[PDB]
Design a protein around this ligand. Structure first.
Ligand SMILES: Cn1ncc(C(=O)NCc2ccc(F)cc2)c1Cl
Length: 149
């Protein structure tokens, strides 16, 4: 799979994260990210996708070693961690045919797993609108504890 790059943007309190909501197959909430182009460096792809999806340019804030990377079904997703972005920042996608909405969410209120359906004796997981964000929540919480405390 082609790697994806993007960002976990946090505000100044470190309480909130910026998620974006797409359409159709991308209809839920997720971190801003997208597919790397031929010959494009990871940091440039992260900045490009985030600027396309949010209108906010992270290029001056990216730290090379500060990211969470996950491999999910054989596709690598790396999100650079970008703290301290004011909550009154005006975010606007370039792409509103791709992005429905852009919101801050409390990190502590976000799920870090899906819920099963053990009440119904049925296998699998209940739908959750944060499903794409979910895999990064626990690693982010652990990263913030280690880096800031
Ligand atoms: C399968 N699937 N469901 C949700 C998402 C996703 O990425 N959600 C956020 C998003 C990121 C970039 C966008 F351009 C649009 C939306 C995916 Cl992938």
């Amino acid at each position: 799979g082609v790697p994806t790059y993007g960002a976990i943007i946090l505000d100044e309190t470190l309480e909130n994260v910026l998620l974006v909501q797409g359409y159709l197959a991308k209809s839920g909430w997720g971190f801003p990210k997208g597919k790397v182009n031929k010959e494009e460096a990871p940091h440039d792809c992260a900045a490009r996708e985030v600027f396309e999806e949010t209108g906010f340019d992270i290029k001056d804030y990216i730290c090379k070693d500060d990211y969470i990377e996950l491999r999910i079904n054989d596709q690598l997703a790396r999100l650079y961690i970008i703290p301290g972005i004011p909550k009154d920042t005006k975010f606007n996608p370039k792409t509103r045919r791709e992005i429905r909405n852009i919101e801050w969410f409390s990190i502590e209120k976000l799920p870090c797993h899906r819920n099963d359906m053990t009440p119904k004796s049925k296998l699998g997981l209940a739908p959750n609108k944060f499903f794409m964000a979910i895999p990064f929540i626990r690693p982010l919480r652990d990263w913030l504890s280690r880096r800031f405390g």
